[PDB]
Amino acid sequence: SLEIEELARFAVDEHNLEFVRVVKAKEQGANMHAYADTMYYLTLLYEAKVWVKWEMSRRLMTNFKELQ
Amino acid sequence: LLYPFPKDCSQAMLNGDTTSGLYTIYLNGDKAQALEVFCDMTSDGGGWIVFLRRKNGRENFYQNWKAYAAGFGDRREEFWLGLDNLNKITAQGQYELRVDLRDHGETAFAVYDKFSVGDAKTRYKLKVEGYSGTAGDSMAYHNGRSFSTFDKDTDSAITNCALSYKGAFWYRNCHRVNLMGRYGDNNHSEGVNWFHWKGHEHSIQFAEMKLRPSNFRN
């Protein structure tokens, strides 16, 4: 829920509106492995699509977001 | 002939060859650089070099880097044209990509207005942009990725995508397209997948990827 709110705030920031709350959140599209890239479908009324992606950098696992 | 050494299937078609089948093309119209390719002359205006065909599972697509660089298979049947060939063809001008999918009497397709493959030094880096069609935009996820096989992973991969998902592709983490995946494999993400058409738990019966100059549209 804290992570979902950070995604929703990130989406509003990337679009820029003043974030009030998350109405609905669903994840879809990940391959069947731990730390697979996934799309969040957020209702906040607005509908946002936010990538949560993972990449290795110098044998460290990194996590980043993109507004779709 | 209008083009005595046709450099792709669109020049072969402009020469008056209108029947799908095997044709000799010549990279950069060089007589010394003959390549026998399968031309799809009937789909969506014709003039297409086919570079992937899946239709029955008879051919092995779970192959190493060298096989994907060189190409493998009977070009009349299931095959992969080879990444060196794709690099050299896409370097000749501005090519578009078409993907034809068929499954249990249903059909869909995707077109990408810009399609190119980098050289071996780039690990055959994919450029794929400008989606239209009915299959859904599953290649966008793969734009900018290097190629990977079970025996050559990337320094950015979380898991070995080719090993895990029984194929070879321009993987990220890992795919929304797996058209060189394992035939008939409905296990999550392991099969002949086009995510935005049939998802990760449905291996598609028939798939072709093909390319031609984008100016052929006009």
From Swiss-Prot, chain B:
Glycans are attached at N187. Detected in fibroblasts (at protein level). It is found in: Secreted, Extracellular space, Extracellular matrix. It comes from the Eukaryota. Residues 1-215 form the Fibrinogen C-terminal domain. It is linked to Deafness, autosomal dominant, 56: A form of non-syndromic sensorineural hearing loss. Sensorineural deafness results from damage to the neural receptors of the inner ear, the nerve pathways to the brain, or the area of the brain that receives sound information. DFNA56 is characterized by progressive hearing impairment with postlingual onset. Belongs to the tenascin family. Extracellular matrix protein implicated in guidance of migrating neurons as well as axons during development, synaptic plasticity as well as neuronal regeneration. Promotes neurite outgrowth from cortical neurons grown on a monolayer of astrocytes. Ligand for integrins alpha-8/beta-1, alpha-9/beta-1, alpha-V/beta-3 and alpha-V/beta-6. In tumors, stimulates angiogenesis by elongation, migration and sprouting of endothelial cells. Homohexamer; disulfide-linked. A homotrimer may be formed in the triple coiled-coil region and may be stabilized by disulfide rings at both ends. Two of such half-hexabrachions may be disulfide linked within the central globule. Interacts with CSPG4. Interacts (via the 3rd fibronectin type-III domain) with integrin ITGA9:ITGB1. This is Tenascin. It comes from Homo sapiens. The gene is TNC. The chain holds residues 1976 to 2193 of 2201 of the full protein.
